[model samples]
Target chain A: GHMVLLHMKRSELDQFLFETTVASTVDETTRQMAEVHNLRHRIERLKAEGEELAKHGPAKRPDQQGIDRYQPVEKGPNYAEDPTGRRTGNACDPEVAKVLVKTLEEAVAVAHKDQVAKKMPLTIKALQEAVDNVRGAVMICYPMGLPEWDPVRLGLEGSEDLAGTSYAADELPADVATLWFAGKQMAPEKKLSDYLGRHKTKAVVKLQKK
Target chain B: HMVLLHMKRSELDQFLFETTVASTVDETTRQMAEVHNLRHRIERLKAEGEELAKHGPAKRPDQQGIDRYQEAPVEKGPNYAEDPTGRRTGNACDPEVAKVLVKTLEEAVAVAHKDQVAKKMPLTIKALQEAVDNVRGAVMICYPMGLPEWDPVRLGLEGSEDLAGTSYAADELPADVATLWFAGKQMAPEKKLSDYLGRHEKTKAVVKLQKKGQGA
Candidate 1:
């Protein structure tokens, strides 16, 4: 009976449902929405890295040797050789790759927009749980953890040192963020009941910089 | 269609953000009337400092009459209101510092203004941040120790402004309690522009911002 559809101004795909009630404060809901939005971007970055890692040696490290005996292994479809010469394309044990694939698929499922249509609203707890599962899977595959500069590791930890990456400029902190519905800002001091008419309603809320 | 935002008080009109009918309400309201508020506050601060300067600095007169009075006689200067809470020093910022403040204010107002036809620049938070930073730079120069925590300017910079009980309160209704009225009908938050104005791509609509409970 309680859910709010939060959307980002940038794209149609950047939308999700939050389970909440009229009793919840707009300020608290805003923070939670912004967090999920930011986390979604991080997950996208991780997914892209996973795709690249799949081509080289799915779940393989750069320092590892290839079966080609010093020769580069055949790159997979959609593979773009790293311009920075950072990836080795070496193959890892298939068992490690299986964990990477399963964990990321689950992460995507937890936050996917399809959940809204399925009548399953995502909570902050669910998203964090998905993130934790990915973290555990990464640790299991690479015990030592990837390099600090690795996008996969950085995405999981939510690091801000993504200066050279595409995700750098998009991340927003909750303190400087805001939400807008219709043409009105959902001010921090107000409660959801102040703007919403009923407890069971689906409204589109926009996230923006304050 | 261009949505014209008109304020009830003093009849102020400005353009708001828009793109397509399918464009979510979230996108349309992201670029709301924040720049106007920023420009107004900057102007007010500048004018207040100028008005205070005409009366001269806030230096207290000689304390010779203090001993003659039993109730701790107070020597006062321009706009002096004793802070019973003991927070302010009852002294004004220097005239020279006031001059610098006005100049920064002038720059901020100019940066905040947008002319749709002649200079159609997309309103951006980066531009807003720049204007705020310039004014903050000036405030720090005048009071390096920082202005009082209760100061409106300080609160605004910290992103927690409360304009209650001020003259600006009538016009500056916070977005939480505000609504957009188009053609005498309240635009439903969940609906799209096409639902209200039809699927026509180009048009103009006069939208009014009124406080909640003030029905269209």
Candidate 2:
């Protein structure tokens, strides 16, 4: 089609179902229900391609009287049509829907503030917010750990930005630190069960508690 | 689980030290530290998984644990299109214009059923881009609520050179089926899709179906 449809989150899918299945038959509901599953399967099938594109994005259609190899550009013949649908955002990650939507909301405030400054609203604000949200999304999904120290394990106020929480409290390296530091720590010397039990992933600190 | 065969840096370093150069205190510290970091992350992942089981299903859509044939908000977020120029006609075009081909006019020939338009939000042949790229893909019911007219040309469809022709036909349209495309010179969607069960209505109003589980 000349247009592109953005990807949906599972919650958004549910929302769509809720809107449409009001008076539908049980069978009709089941069919679309299966359709959702089918759609997800297709999305997963497309994920590798998406990631590959992310890693190595396609270059813009070359046109210096040069030719593009993108859509509308056929073999040997000619190329026509402005780029339709620059991007197809996919909240493929269900949680991504929440973050992306919420961050997009934040983009609004940024835009509002821009207009107050008599500046180009929405343009830069949207770009910045989108980039921030993309970073936030990566943190949530990828194996990359947060850059700051685990605040709970360190009495250092929320502002001390440089820290690392290690799983094993022994043989630490130069840059990476243990759960303990600077004569202060999170409830030091408690039993492993209690020391970490009060936390979600304080095992690095709690492992030493006997 | 038969996890794939894997090796750790420590294992490799151990081999290296045992066979050749002495392992530096710094090297050992760094390698062990890295392993510990990975260990912490792994535990965190498991902990998160357990936490989720206590609360709800997985965060990934594929991990949805709902009943196989089950279904489920009209939680429309706060609208941010505060353009006072009335750029948007109250109706929510709640999608990024850059993301979707906003609208272009094109023509095609088909027995366009109003019901199909209401059910299958097809693409408007006219308003789309890259006609050649989408040679065969441009066949969607652009308006889920049906267009005001069935004559592809009259309905604001243009470049039909791709289709059979720039012409159209209404095959066996029920006389009970009213035929009036009086859009008052131009399509004014303010005119609801209705006024038809009452008056043979005319005007074009096409809205995108952005919800999930629904075909676009």
Candidate 3:
């Protein structure tokens, strides 16, 4: 495993712990939606494994149950897998993704009334803009093709680790040097975790689009 | 199997330091570099029979504690959602489960980055699911700590696949990192894993619950 070690002022680490956002591209968001679908698929499948085994017995692989079930029967053109063998279909099934994402936008827009997601809603396109137009200071991690997940995603405790890592981020006093991470365009130069969006770039002279 | 070693810190504090690639290492990690090295070691050893190289004192003289670890290719762990263990907590999070989930994701991301998933898709998927099952532990800790009201940027990503070229329908499922990111969304307070699974077939169990609830 690769290791990265960074020593910084407690205040700086705290700032990073609480003040970052997932500035992303449409492509990355689209990719994430697909992930939501697949994750659910696997979670359910694994959870229901007992029921499957109960019905069928045993199989050579963990995914397969008994004679045959949950197996894709064909590979269509352009690498599509479906019961019908048609490449044109979204066999990867963004259906779950479409639902999950839309619900995200709706709930955030309605429940919290947070303008962060209201104007455009949380579509892949909207998130792409969100990253581009984030207010105040924003951070991005490069050399990585995707965004770092929300620390909370690691689970509630996952967030706790970051909050208390090295010390209670909030308890520390903010020194001028506390913001020593994320250089030009708020992109990460050190402290690998500060901006984990992976892909980074500066905007050339151009007009902003909201 | 062969292993590529990174750091070999002594079990003791003063004894502890780290290595890069050829960093004075011990034990073996099945990294691609190590995997390929094993092949050559076997062939060359046959060419010349000599003892494996030995270094340092028998156990580091400074060794105060023993922290030993062996790297292995990922394995799918026991299901948290399944009550089969009778002690299992049907998808809720806990410190143990969270530790495992965190460890699993850390190891998995490390393993997946070892190679392009497109080429070794199946291996990547198995390692990642290990994270999904354990995220329950994480979810347990995060939900109440502030997840319900956690940072919009931080709260959502609470959880986290692929398969292909291959026969399995799953390899073609989706990217593992992407799945974890998505689970981040699903497990967000706005939605829960059970609500997301929504009566799906696979979801009967490695499946649901709040290990603990709410987020800041």
Candidate 4:
């Protein structure tokens, strides 16, 4: 028979509690209560094991360097105002943003290194293009509080000339006021194609017509 | 200003007629009707363009040997199921049945592939165990119809042990059964692993922990 044992340290348990409960709002209070109950059960089990260790003299901690060394930085809480002046909150601490950024950079660097190792220029180019496309879309949608630009709608337009033209279909803030401060004047017929082409060129790829 | 054009074609009209008036009894008839209508409208617009092209002389056909030409011999015969059990009672002309059958077969194939992958050696035991455990839990909770006799809990427990020991698991099914039933079972685990790694390099990379002459 195979046995799988998952052991959690007190610190880890505490962190989990803080992350799941204190991180959530009152609406999630019921879920937090259940988690608190589970934590209590886990703590009781750990305490019993600790009692046995105390009776036999303090047990030396295992070589936990691999685990302990990887301490993720905390992030600052998010603060934003809604249309109604209700300040939206986030639980992430300031250090968490740095950690996230560093981790992402490291991941990208590692991926690039792997591409170099494989001597696959095409793969690297493709990855760069994909990343750029996503980044461009994210930049456009993030500030509007919209989940993301609809990929299906973009694809349905078929012609690149119609890209980003939808933004002007409705009332839009001045380009300078929006995050896209350095906006280019585009004819509606060429907007989509131009935006796509510009972004594609930056990523070293030409957007091909399907 | 961006112009939104709504055009209808003859083919789209015919498709809509076939979808709505022809099969109002089917569940997806309305959705099928809408799709058909949309398709017909697009077709009409395209056809109008094609009609305008008729006024111009047709381009000369390619005379040089077609570089990309490939011919496949078509198999001729009635390609109907034998229905060995003689339990067939559904409408033979209904396209919905065919769609359902294809979907069900694809889903079954996927599940069988998952199971075959689980029994194979050199598998990611942790992930495999989690997959099996999840399935077992779902089965217990949902009590889905036509549950398999194989105990998922037992399989999960034994599989985890085997993975820890061998860091690999051989496909438990016989070669004939595996080949006839589940896809990819006849191949060596390393070959399968290589193909998987090639497609999903990030997740399937040979980590240092599992590499030769490493921690293991």
Measured against the true two-chain complex, the DockQ scores of the candidates, in the order shown, are 0.01, 0.03, 0.01, 0.01
The runs of at least 3 residues in candidate 3 whose Cα sits more than 4 Å from the true structure, single-residue gaps closed, are: A1-210, B1-82, B91-107, B110-216
Predicted candidate 2 versus true structure: per-residue lDDT over B61-103, tens digit per residue: 3323333222421222233222232221112322332112121
TM-score of each: 0.42, 0.16, 0.15, 0.16
List clashing residue pairs in candidate 1: B1-B203
| Tens-digit lDDT track of model 3 for B105-184 | 33333333322111111232233444333433444443344222222112212321011243422112121111211233
TM-score of chain A of each: 0.77, 0.19, 0.19, 0.19
The DockQ leader among the candidates is 2
Residue A14 error, candidate 1, Å: 0.8
List candidate 2 segments past 4 Å from native: A1-21, A49-210, B1-83, B86-216
Cα lDDT of model 1 by residue, B76-106, tens digit: 6554544332333344455445556666665
lDDT (CA) for every model shown?
0.59, 0.25, 0.24, 0.25
Which lDDT tens digits does candidate 4 get at residues B132-176?
344334333322232222322223323322333442222122222
TM-score of chain B of each: 0.62, 0.18, 0.20, 0.18
Q: List model 2 lDDT by residue over A23-67, tens digit each.
A: 233233233333333322222222332232232222232232222
lDDT of 3 by residue, A1-210 (tens): 222222221222111011112344323322333322222222222223212222222223223323222434333222222222211122222322232233233223221223222211123343333223211001111112111232211221122232444333222221211222333222223432334433322211111111
- Stretches of candidate 4 off by over 4 Å are A1-210, B1-123, B144-216
